[PDB]
Amino acid sequence: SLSIIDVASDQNLFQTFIKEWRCKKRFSISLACEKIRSIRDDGFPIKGCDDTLVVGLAVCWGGRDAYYFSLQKEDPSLTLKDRMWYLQSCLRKESDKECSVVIYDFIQSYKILLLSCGISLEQSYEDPKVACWLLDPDSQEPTLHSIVTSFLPHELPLLEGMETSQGIQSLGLNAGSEHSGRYRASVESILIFNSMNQLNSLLQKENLQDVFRKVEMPSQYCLALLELNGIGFSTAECESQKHIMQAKLDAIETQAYQLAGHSFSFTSSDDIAEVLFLELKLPPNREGRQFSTSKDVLNKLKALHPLPGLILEWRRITNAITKVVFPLQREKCLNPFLGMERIYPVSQSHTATGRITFTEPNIQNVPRDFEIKMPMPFSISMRHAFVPFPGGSILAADYSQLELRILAHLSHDRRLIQVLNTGADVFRSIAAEWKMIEPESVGDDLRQQAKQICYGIIYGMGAKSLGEQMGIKENDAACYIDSFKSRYTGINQFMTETVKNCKRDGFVQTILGRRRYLPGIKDNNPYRKAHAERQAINTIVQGSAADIVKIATVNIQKQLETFHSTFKSHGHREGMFCPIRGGFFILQLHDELLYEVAEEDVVQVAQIVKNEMESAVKLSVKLKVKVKIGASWGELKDFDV
DNA sequence: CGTAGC
DNA sequence: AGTGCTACG
Ligand SMILES: Cc1cn([C@H]2C[C@H](O)[C@@H](COP(=O)(O)OP(=O)(O)OP(=O)(O)O)O2)c(=O)[nH]c1=O
Ligand SMILES: [Mg+2]
């Protein structure tokens, strides 16, 4: 059955285990965590969860043999210092040591190994959860129990009476079930190693291991570095914005109260509907629940009466002040090592299109520069609150219409290629065509609306929805759709070809080989069929974009790893020259990367990005990247030197 | 389900 | 329930 080897029990056993580990090229280390049971005696305390303490590691390189490694203060001959030195020695790559480390929940394992244990891995990684995601990107988040059931049933009974295996975290990370940390870590390590062998066989069968080891797992490593770094958050430039928007809120409240003649609650939709549609006789739309008070109907009614405009403005600003201001202010970590407050989001890569999202909180869902003025515009935005460390500047690198360039690549539209190769800025052109104005006369919000429209036709938009958004009639929207389709016939050819491919093969192929499965295209419902077709088109295009940005991330990390021989990330800095210097990667926005570059390497690192993002993949269309730098994310300015 | 980003 | 990836409330 289960065979746990207590390595730290005998000196000879420890030495032969170390020799075998050094002679091994594929291991499955893991972590063990227990309760305090009341620091520096049970193990290294885990950052964040002060009630949890690390205990041991579990390494399994085949079969059911789990070699448990103890970092406890207790074999008295083997002290903690030389044991730590040995563990660091066998967990580092050197002299072409092509070792693969299989860790479940690699980001969290890397973080705990760095901050508390003080050791950072440098070998190839083979996270089994990532491979399970690669198999079925649209599937639910893979817990240990799910991957064990779906990829290792014979050894599945090893989890009998183990309710902790169903949690999101690894078996050896949770502070739950009564099982000891050592045994839990050992059984989890055996299970993940065997399941990862099965997953590697499956990926080799599917021809997906290259995209799993060359870009995907290095992208997980980059995301671990991003989680270690965090985003520099300053409350000096956030509290002021919060107070300004609260002042605007109360001003709008008083104005609406004096206009309507009475005080009413804005949050309640029924009261707003009664006040606006009934009392003020505003024209109701076709479609409790007496009237609909959605954003689009309020926007349509903005011109007719001033009050709906104030209501809509109050709703946004309160959405900014509750869904954004509160999550950011609630979780900010003040660390003296960087000398300023930061925020550490949790990077989730299990999205259905290969995109990278952030949970607790969602940083990318921060309101942009929207200007509102009260008794000229203030340009209120919380993006300015993301001030980097002192002596450093945020260096974003926005892809210049990556989605359109990629679509032109797999569509081979001569007109699209020739309009993207130049600095035409097709979004400005379509905005100028729509508004019958000069391209330079367009604004930021107008250009954003134009780009939303253009991507709407690009991914497939109904005539009615395009009419409601564009403010034009349904027939005019249909004629606009037809003109857009006829102008770019290659886009239609690519869309039809990829829809046919999704219907035939049952899935779609990203340009780096990753696949997403859409059974819904075979659904008899016309809604489901059309939704799955548009889902397939956007899935291939957006997965290509996300894989391009992930290749850019891993290439930039490699380039600033070879250069700038300093501490790799703030997590490595706190794992324990003095000046902060590096190209730390702090945020991804689904099309761009934020780098908290130091004030001395602003230009050179930027150039590196402008290389690696440009030559990430040799496409049919040159991938323009605008590198912007600034003292904050809010007011970053373009840099073309 | 409505709304914010991409 | 007819632009899609999300995340939060
Ligand atoms: C606004 C918008 C973006 N997107 C997607 C398309 C791409 O995946 C991504 C674009 O990210 P942006 O970085 O927002 O778009 P861009 O690269 O096209 O251009 P700009 O330099 O003007 O900022 O977001 C939509 O699908 N629909 C929309 O309405
Ligand atoms: Mg962008």
Side-chain angles (χ1 to χ4, degrees), chain A residues 1-36 39-49 51-80 82-163 167-285 287-370 372 374-437 439 441-641:
Chain A
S1 61
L2 159 82
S3 303
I4 295 181
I5 283 90
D6 301 332
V7 164
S9 68
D10 288 330
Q11 214 290 322
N12 310 87
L13 187 55
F14 182 93
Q15 284 302 139
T16 184
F17 160 80
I18 283 290
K19 174 201 163 52
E20 176 70 25
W21 207 358
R22 292 182 194 271
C23 293
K24 194 42 202 163
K25 308 286 286 303
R26 276 187 54 115
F27 36 99
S28 187
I29 94 173
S30 191
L31 271 309
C33 313
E34 302 179 341
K35 266 71 53 171
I36 305 302
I39 308 177
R40 300 182 179 92
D41 296 75
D42 207 351
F44 315 95
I46 284 195
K47 310 307 207 215
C49 303
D51 64 307
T52 319
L53 254 164
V54 84
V55 165
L57 278 76
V59 186
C60 158
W61 49 72
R64 306 170 50 123
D65 254 324
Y67 298 68
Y68 166 78
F69 197 105
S70 173
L71 318 102
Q72 306 260 14
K73 53 100 151 196
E74 49 261 26
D75 200 1
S77 70
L78 278 175
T79 196
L80 199 53
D82 68 331
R83 199 153 36 182
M84 276 343 297
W85 147 252
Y86 264 121
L87 181 54
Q88 160 196 157
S89 292
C90 37
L91 262 190
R92 220 195 307 111
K93 110 171 305 173
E94 58 264 346
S95 71
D96 292 358
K97 197 78 68 175
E98 191 181 354
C99 281
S100 292
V101 199
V102 175
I103 331 175
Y104 181 81
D105 213 26
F106 162 65
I107 289 107
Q108 192 69 23
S109 293
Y110 193 104
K111 288 175 52 182
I112 53 196
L113 278 175
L114 189 45
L115 321 183
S116 67
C117 329
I119 57 166
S120 58
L121 320 94
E122 252 305 307
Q123 296 103 322
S124 290
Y125 317 106
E126 279 193 326
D127 193 317
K129 164 181 304 188
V130 164
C132 183
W133 166 60
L134 254 313
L135 263 304
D136 258 316
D138 54 67
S139 75
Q140 195 214 330
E141 204 142 4
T143 184
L144 180 51
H145 195 7
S146 70
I147 76 198
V148 165
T149 304
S150 267
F151 299 119
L152 201 78
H154 64 84
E155 163 86 339
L156 162 53
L158 253 286
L159 294 164
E160 53 199 352
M162 221 147 189
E163 42 266 3
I168 320 172
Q169 337 168 46
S170 44
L171 198 47
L173 265 181
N174 69 83
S177 292
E178 195 258 346
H179 313 88
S180 178
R182 157 190 152 280
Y183 158 75
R184 222 159 67 263
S186 299
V187 64
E188 170 261 12
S189 77
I190 297 180
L191 270 286
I192 64 180
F193 184 76
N194 280 272
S195 64
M196 183 62 207
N197 259 339
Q198 177 74 25
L199 290 171
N200 263 340
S201 288
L202 272 169
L203 289 178
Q204 247 153 25
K205 169 251 163 193
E206 185 162 333
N207 205 326
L208 212 62
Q209 194 172 343
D210 227 359
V211 85
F212 162 70
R213 283 185 318 113
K214 288 235 300 165
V215 58
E216 186 36 76
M217 271 325 307
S219 179
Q220 296 289 288
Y221 172 80
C222 292
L223 284 184
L225 286 196
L226 147 145
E227 200 149 336
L228 292 159
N229 283 315
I231 316 176
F233 189 87
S234 79
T235 36
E237 271 311 324
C238 177
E239 274 270 0
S240 164
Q241 302 267 335
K242 165 177 171 182
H243 292 338
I244 277 165
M245 325 148 57
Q246 219 147 261
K248 169 59 77 159
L249 255 62
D250 58 65
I252 286 184
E253 285 272 356
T254 57
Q255 173 145 331
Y257 286 176
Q258 73 64 50
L259 169 162
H262 58 297
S263 297
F264 56 95
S265 178
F266 275 77
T267 88
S268 56
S269 316
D270 36 49
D271 157 81
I272 298 292
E274 287 180 7
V275 154
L276 188 69
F277 292 93
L278 288 176
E279 292 200 1
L280 263 289
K281 307 156 301 304
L282 265 301
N285 72 324
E287 174 68 30
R289 314 255 203 283
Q290 47 258 9
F291 290 125
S292 294
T293 315
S294 296
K295 161 97 142 174
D296 43 18
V297 302
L298 267 273
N299 263 317
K300 289 200 307 175
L301 267 53
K302 275 200 320 177
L304 277 82
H305 203 281
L307 170 68
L310 318 152
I311 288 186
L312 206 58
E313 283 292 336
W314 179 93
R315 270 216 201 139
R316 154 189 260 289
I317 308 204
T318 203
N319 153 280
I321 207 79
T322 62
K323 287 206 195 7
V324 167
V325 152
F326 253 91
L328 293 191
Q329 284 274 340
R330 151 178 76 181
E331 47 186 292
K332 45 163 195 300
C333 320
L334 178 136
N335 49 78
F337 299 18
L338 283 101
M340 39 84 82
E341 294 177 344
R342 316 193 55 81
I343 164 181
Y344 302 99
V346 152
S347 47
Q348 162 186 348
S349 324
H350 202 71
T351 76
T353 202
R355 206 156 259 211
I356 290 157
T357 53
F358 292 84
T359 47
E360 312 153 359
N362 205 175
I363 280 287
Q364 320 150 330
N365 293 3
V366 153
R368 43 205 307 199
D369 294 294
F370 72 100
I372 186 163
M374 42 175 198
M376 201 208 176
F378 303 170
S379 180
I380 292 313
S381 67
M382 330 299 301
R383 298 203 155 168
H384 181 31
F386 296 107
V387 177
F389 60 91
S393 67
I394 306 280
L395 197 140
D398 178 65
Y399 256 125
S400 279
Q401 317 145 38
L402 177 63
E403 227 70 35
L404 274 157
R405 296 184 182 280
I406 290 200
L407 192 53
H409 162 84
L410 319 89
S411 71
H412 314 102
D413 274 88
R414 50 151 285 281
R415 174 151 30 191
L416 208 44
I417 289 156
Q418 88 177 14
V419 84
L420 262 307
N421 266 320
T422 77
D425 203 7
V426 57
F427 285 155
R428 230 160 266 264
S429 298
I430 192 157
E433 289 267 5
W434 172 31
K435 279 316 176 68
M436 311 295 340
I437 58 182
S441 184
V442 82
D444 68 306
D445 216 47
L446 188 52
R447 180 166 179 275
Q448 284 302 139
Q449 209 163 3
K451 99 148 75 156
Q452 307 223 168
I453 291 292
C454 166
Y455 277 136
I457 316 90
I458 274 283
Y459 293 152
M461 257 199 106
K464 184 206 294 180
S465 190
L466 185 76
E468 291 146 290
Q469 174 154 48
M470 207 169 185
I472 83 187
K473 287 182 52 56
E474 185 163 21
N475 293 326
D476 289 359
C479 94
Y480 200 95
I481 291 281
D482 296 346
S483 67
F484 200 100
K485 286 202 189 312
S486 57
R487 270 184 312 205
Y488 311 139
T489 190
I491 298 308
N492 274 300
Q493 152 171 322
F494 167 79
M495 273 173 18
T496 48
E497 162 208 10
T498 195
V499 156
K500 181 224 306 179
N501 287 4
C502 173
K503 200 165 309 173
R504 171 172 48 92
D505 298 68
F507 61 92
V508 315
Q509 268 262 357
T510 312
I511 202 53
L512 292 291
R514 306 189 305 110
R515 312 159 151 210
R516 193 231 175 106
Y517 294 88
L518 301 163
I521 176 156
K522 306 312 288 177
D523 209 305
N524 312 330
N525 199 310
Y527 178 175
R528 294 301 221 299
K529 170 101 60 194
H531 180 58
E533 288 157 359
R534 294 171 300 91
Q535 213 163 59
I537 305 164
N538 191 14
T539 278
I540 172 177
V541 167
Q542 211 172 299
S544 305
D547 221 292
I548 295 320
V549 85
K550 271 185 290 186
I551 293 183
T553 316
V554 307
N555 288 18
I556 292 161
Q557 211 64 45
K558 283 177 186 172
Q559 207 67 16
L560 72 99
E561 229 173 21
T562 60
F563 295 161
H564 327 101
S565 289
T566 71
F567 300 140
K568 182 147 23 187
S569 151
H570 307 134
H572 294 75
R573 272 179 37 79
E574 64 202 81
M576 301 145 188
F577 205 95
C578 186
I580 321 100
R581 187 146 165 202
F584 331 113
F585 161 54
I586 65 185
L587 183 55
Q588 152 152 357
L589 283 132
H590 306 169
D591 231 347
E592 89 172 307
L593 303 92
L594 258 69
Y595 286 92
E596 206 181 15
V597 200
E599 78 153 347
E600 214 280 298
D601 296 354
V602 194
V603 45
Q604 161 197 12
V605 168
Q607 213 165 69
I608 285 306
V609 182
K610 205 159 57 189
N611 193 16
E612 304 277 25
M613 282 195 84
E614 264 270 39
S615 75
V617 170
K618 265 302 163 203
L619 285 161
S620 303
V621 165
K622 164 142 81 73
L623 287 189
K624 265 177 50 189
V625 38
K626 279 186 231 314
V627 170
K628 316 165 141 273
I629 327 172
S632 297
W633 183 19
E635 45 240 53
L636 80 179
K637 314 287 175 49
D638 220 319
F639 164 100
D640 40 36
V641 198

